[PDB]
Amino acid sequence: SVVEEHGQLSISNGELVNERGEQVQLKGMSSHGLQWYGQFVNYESMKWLRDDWGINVFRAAMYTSSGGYIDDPSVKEKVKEAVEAAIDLDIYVIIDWHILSDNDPNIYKEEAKDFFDEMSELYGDYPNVIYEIANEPNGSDVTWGNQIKPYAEEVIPIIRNNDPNNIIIVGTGTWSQDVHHAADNQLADPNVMYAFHFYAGTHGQNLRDQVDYALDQGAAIFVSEWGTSAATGDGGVFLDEAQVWIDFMDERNLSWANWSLTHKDESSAALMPGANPTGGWTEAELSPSGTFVREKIRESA
């Protein structure tokens, strides 16, 4: 229903809009690393998220390093499974080239180009697909102007040759926090958004102001990853600050995906250790973070 209703997404005046030019907001879940917790990514679990939580987007977090795609490329097939499930369930799907320890997206740019060529050739005539080409660039030697923007200007043409206008989300500096620099030096493609990530354990008032600055330059922002925890993915749950961000994102029409759908023993994990990888979770099988995030999406839906 979601993808049939909203159809082709695009960017208009710095806002995510549907095929009638009306603003739309996506809210959903991210997987954890597909090389570790891929069992939670399947049609049945995604259908349960759609029906019980109300998600309208799912993010497939394909780590490149840390035992991910570069080390074992078989994980690409789990991304395909996720995309195909999203198509079958009529929700949107983010294909996330999940750089992290490989902190400069240029390190594996040749592999990125080949991967995005394949994904856009396969899925480029579906409106469900959103490409996230570099999760979290990081490091003082990885800047927008010198590293990230030129990387994007190599990968985006590869995608555009197969898929002229589905949304592409491009990571920003300092673990996708430096939207200010991106917004002052924007890419040419009209259907690009810049990633912004936050963790509720970090006091967020200036980060909100920075997002507003970026929006004020006409840059479109997708909050492609956020958590209720500290910035490590653990360290407790911070629901008061999470709620401030939830309200902020609704006020600004910002789409988002929460980290993450796993039973891992860390505060950001949505599920408790006994949670069925195919869905059906009772209240007791959701963590404090999962309970909150589910309530946020249900409220919205």
UniProtKB/Swiss-Prot annotation:
Example GO biological process: cellulose catabolic process
MF (Gene Ontology): carbohydrate binding; cellulase activity
Gene transcribed to yield this protein: cel5A
Record keywords, A-Z: Carbohydrate metabolism, Cellulose degradation, Glycosidase, Hydrolase, Polysaccharide degradation, Secreted, Signal
Listed EC numbers: 3.2.1.4
CC terms in the record's Gene Ontology section: extracellular region
Subunit composition and interactions: Monomer.
Active site per the UniProt annotation: 136, 225
Binding site for substrate: 32, 36-37, 63, 98, 199, 231-232, 259, 264-266
Top-level class of the enzyme under EC nomenclature: hydrolase
Name of the protein this chain belongs to: Endoglucanase 5A
UniProt subcellular location: Secreted
Residues included from the entire protein: 30 to 330 of 400
